[PDB]
Design a protein around this nucleic acid. Structure first.
Lengths: 127, 141, 162, 152, 97, 202
RNA sequence: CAUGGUUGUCGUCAGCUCGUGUCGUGAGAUGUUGGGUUAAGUCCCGCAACGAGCGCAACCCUUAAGCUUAGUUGCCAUCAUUAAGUUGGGCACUCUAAGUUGACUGCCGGUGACAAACCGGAGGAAGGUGGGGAUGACGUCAAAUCAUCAUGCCCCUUAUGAUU
């Protein structure tokens, strides 16, 4: 059993799979606490399968790609959310109402020319 | 019943005098309903379908009784010269003869053919505007 | 209250550099009682017609522009300072209107008048519908009495004679 | 759009340790220059000294300390010109939450010790015991807005 | 064999990829079809003013659309499309053997 | 305002190229050979009703397509001047093979012609407002939809320059569907240069 | 400050005009105002105005989720001889990289009366011009460049041009 979902946020793609077992993540073939830096946002990263209560059910073992640590995280909780709707397909409203299953809503904004960087206009003296 | 041309909504403001731009749009109502009975309707955006139909009803709102009329009239029949004073002022510039229902709060000077009757009652209209509508039918044959 | 002076194709002297600050400078120093600003003086020669003088003094809210198209660069500033002194008084009396004496601190039934008129009951139904009103009161054409046609909670019509 | 109407305020994510929204909002205000981890570690080492110098767990102590910080009257200036132009106005509940967090951090940065290991926790136990520096400016607002009470 | 298909327009490099995939399958070929390589664009940022003004400029870019065609059944009928030069307008073909 | 030219929106969006070749290595030098023979074709033809040219290069057989509102004048007398052009065009570059020419109907609805033939109505110095109105009235008479044209500097012979535009018809400069074609000529009148823009549509 | 080109600027500011008709002895007026809506002279009502153009929205580009085609130098769950050759096979599946299907107040409920909107839902990944870019109306400033060019006039020609 391999329920393989994908997930994107902030220029960082994250594809997951779901092998049965218990809750244990193997991001880039290594431990999460030695890969994700400070362990705070991991309990916010466990929010999507919290509402389906499949804690001791699924090992995931993500292969992540690109971005940063808050771009790799917040993309595997969106990663397994596309995979949780092929594990519990009737539980789509439990993830739609609370968070995870929305999108990659927003990335960095374009630097316009004639300007310092990304909508921050430069200082002028004489008003 | 008379086979003549009616006006239900407000006077459009020039349909006897600036009707070289009103018949420009009576040409449109002879065209816009032809435009969607044939093709050239699936390729259009679904909201452009709306404004092409939002134009379509608003033509037959005001110009609905001038649907088949393509020339100037030769007589005009008004129910009230007070509320329809825009029409009577266009009548006297074109020397078109005029007949109308007048009462109190109506000037009979601009009406050539005067019908003194009540104006704020339905049977006072309907049992008086029907015979004048009937008046042309036995003038045909 | 500096003077970034610069002349388009005119060599600036030092007799101008004392005549500016006496008139453009000092007569606006006693205006703007908390001052920190920079002036700008252009002198643009035109060989076909004349010279011109542009004096711009920006401030916190409203700037101060004036122009003279004279050729005398000493008599023209006698008119620039005239236009400058007028514009400051416009600015100050705009903001000197702070002195304004400002001392800090049932069921209504709307009547709709109607004039009673004689008609058929069918006419009263017609006129009532043309307004969507649930009540229409009239004098009956044949009975002569005051009649109220109304729409019941039934949705049917009722007729009251008063 | 602050003149079309009001801006739609957005949701935050509560802390994992204390299970509190109020802790994460304290993380974001002590987050100088976008550094999330290097500021969150300091707060996670600025309530252990709270729980060392008092036996109670700090999630009780935090919401007890901020109640000596959060004022109930403040001053909004109305442009009346020659009047006092200082109207004593009560505080909306959203600004009631925020402005207590502001005073708690802004005077934690002006103590004798250098580490915010114990710059923060000293002012919390002062605010837990209704004393210190972030408490005493609440009383300064309650000696300013409560002195010009002629504009209720 | 890796027939390199790169060009400036995207409507032209796609219709010239349809030529070479058609004039090879008529012969004895086993064509792995056109897969699109990523476009190697390049942005040029000139300034708009004749004399003075920065802080108001026009950016320019030029995009090359890269594809490749490879065959692994070389017959003398397959190379009739290779020797047969077609669509020489705005596409170059770097024929490798 | 600062209206940019209407072709520049649409090059490749709703139009195509006046040069459709490719060269990865040595892109620079053989791009200069284009505007060598964009100056050179504009030298000896000298308003032979030429609207614009196209260049395509392939395997040292480099093509040149000219439109020539007066066709045959570049051809000559049965292929005379077209062969008399390749006697110099094949010397300024190496090959210049397969020089040809196509024809266009509606000789003065292409905007390059419309700007040019009324700019040459300014060296004789006669009634610039009618020189405007000659172009507008003839435009939708011949089959156009929207027309717009102006003259900028030393207008009428005076000192102060004044723009003077005349317009009717749908000219959607901001709509990206529109096949707007403009041109700019350099009509001298021996008291400066008059500039003239045009705008045609359909 | 004689000009053509060309760019800032008020300013992304929502305005600027025309046909025909009417009113006024006419300069002109209406249209463009009034009622309330919108980012908008954006729509909907009411009115001697009816329509049209230039702007505004959109079409263009990019970003956000999908499908179909084609899978290498790209990407390796399942096979291992992982130095990782990411190699053998091709795994082509996902990913990525490129050719196209789709978001508009389409769809409901309000009491809100029909007058469009607004307000609150659900429906998709996306929701109210989605985010951003490109595009800058009539015009203002004798605004800025005769040093990118181009040329009216004036001036220079053992030099105000040259060469080191």
């Amino acid at each position: 059993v391999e329920y393989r979902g994908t997930g994107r946020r902030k220029n960082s793609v994250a594809r997951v799979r779901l092998v049965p077992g218990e809750g244990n993540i193997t991001v880039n073939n290594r431990d999460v606490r030695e890969y994700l830096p400070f362990e705070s946002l991991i309990l916010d990263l466990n929010q999507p399968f919290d509402v389906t209560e499949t804690k001791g059910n699924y090992d995931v073992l993500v292969n992540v790609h690109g971005g940063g640590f808050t771009g790799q995280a917040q993309a595997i909780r969106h990663g397994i959310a596309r995979a949780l709707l092929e594990a519990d397909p009737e539980y789509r409203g439990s993830l739609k109402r609370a968070g995870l299953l929305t999108r990659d809503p927003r990335m960095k904004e374009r630097k316009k020319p004639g300007l310092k960087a990304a909508r921050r206009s430069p200082q002028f003296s004489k008003r | 019943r008379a086979g003549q041309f009616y006006i239900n909504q407000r006077w459009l403001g020039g349909l006897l005098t600036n009707y070289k731009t009103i018949s420009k749009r009576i040409k449109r109502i002879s065209e816009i309903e032809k435009m969607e009975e044939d093709g050239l309707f699936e390729v259009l955006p679904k909201k452009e379908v709306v404004e092409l139909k939002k134009e379509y009803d608003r033509l037959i709102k005001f110009l609905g009784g001038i649907r088949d009329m393509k020339s100037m009239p030769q007589a005009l029949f008004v129910v009230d010269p007070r509320k329809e004073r825009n029409a009577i002022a266009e009548a006297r510039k074109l020397n078109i003869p005029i007949v109308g229902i007048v009462d109190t709060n109506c000037d009979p000077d601009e009406i050539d053919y005067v019908i003194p009757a009540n104006d704020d009652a339905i049977r006072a209209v309907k049992l008086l505007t029907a015979k004048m509508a009937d008046a042309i039918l036995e003038g045909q044959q | 209250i500096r003077f970034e002076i610069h002349g388009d194709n005119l060599t600036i002297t030092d007799a101008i550099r004392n005549y500016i600050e006496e008139k453009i400078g000092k007569l606006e120093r006693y205006f703007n009682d908390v001052p920190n600003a920079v002036a700008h003086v252009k002198v643009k020669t035109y060989s076909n017609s004349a010279t011109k003088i542009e004096v711009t003094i920006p401030l916190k809210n409203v700037t101060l522009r004036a122009e003279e198209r004279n050729d005398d660069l000493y008599a023209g500033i006698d008119l620039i300072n005239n236009k400058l002194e007028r514009q400051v008084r416009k600015y100050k009396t705009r903001i000197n209107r702070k002195s304004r004496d400002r001392g800090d601190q049932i069921e209504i039934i709307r009547s709709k008048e109607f004039s009673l008129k004689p008609m058929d009951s069918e006419e009263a139904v017609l006129q009532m519908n043309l307004l969507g009103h649930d009540f229409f009161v009239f004098t009956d054409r044949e009975t002569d009495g005051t009649s109220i046609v109304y729409r019941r909670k039934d949705g049917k019509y009722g007729l009251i004679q008063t | 759009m602050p003149r079309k109407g009001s801006v739609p305020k957005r949701d935050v994510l509560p802390d994992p340790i204390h299970n509190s929204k109020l802790v994460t909002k304290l993380i974001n205000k002590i987050m100088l220059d976008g550094k999330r981890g290097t500021a969150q570690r300091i707060l996670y080492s600025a309530f252990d000294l709270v729980e060392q110098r008092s036996g109670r767990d700090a999630l009780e102590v935090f919401e007890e300390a901020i109640n000596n910080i959060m004022p109930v009257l403040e001053v909004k200036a109305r442009r009346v010109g020659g009047s006092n132009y200082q109207v004593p106005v009560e505080v909306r509940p959203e600004r009631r939450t925020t402005l207590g967090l502001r005073w708690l951090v802004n005077y934690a940065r002006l103590r004798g010790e250098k580490t915010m290991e114990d710059r923060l926790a000293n002012e919390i136990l002062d605010a837990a015991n209704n004393t210190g520096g972030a408490v005493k400016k609440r009383e300064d607002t309650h000696k300013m807005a409560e002195a010009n009470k002629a504009f209720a | 064999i890796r027939i390199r298909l790169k060009a400036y327009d995207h409507r032209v490099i796609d219709q010239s990829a349809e030529k070479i995939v058609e004039t090879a399958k008529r012969s004895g070929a086993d064509v792995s079809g056109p897969i699109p390589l990523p476009t190697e664009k390049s942005v040029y940022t000139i300034i708009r003013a004749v004399h003075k003004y920065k802080d108001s400029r026009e950016q320019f870019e030029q995009r090359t659309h890269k594809r490749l065609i490879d065959i692994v059944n070389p017959t003398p009928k397959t190379v009739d499309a290779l020797m047969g030069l077609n669509l020489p307008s705005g596409v170059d073909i770097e024929i490798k053997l | 305002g600062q209206k940019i030219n209407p072709i520049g929106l649409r090059v490749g969006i709703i139009r195509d190229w006046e040069a459709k070749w490719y060269a990865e290595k040595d892109f620079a030098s053989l791009l200069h050979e284009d505007l060598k023979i964009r100056k050179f074709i504009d030298n000896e033809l000298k308003e032979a009703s030429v609207s614009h040219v196209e260049i395509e290069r392939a395997a040292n057989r480099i093509n040149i397509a000219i439109h020539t509102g007066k066709p045959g004048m570049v051809i000559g007398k049965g292929g005379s001047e077209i062969e008399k052009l390749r006697n110099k065009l094949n010397a300024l570059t190496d090959k210049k093979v397969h020089i040809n020419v196509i024809e266009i109907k509606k000789v003065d609805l292409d905007a390059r012609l419309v700007a040019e033939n009324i700019a040459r109505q300014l060296e004789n110095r006669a009634s610039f407002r009618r020189v405007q109105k000659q172009a507008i009235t003839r435009a939708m008479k011949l089959g156009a939809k929207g027309i717009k044209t102006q003259v900028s500097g030393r207008l009428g012979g005076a000192d102060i320059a004044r723009a003077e535009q005349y317009s009717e018809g749908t000219v959607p400069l901001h709509t990206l569907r529109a096949d707007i074609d403009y041109a700019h000529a350099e009509a001298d009148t021996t008291y400066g240069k008059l500039g003239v823009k045009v705008w045609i549509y359909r």
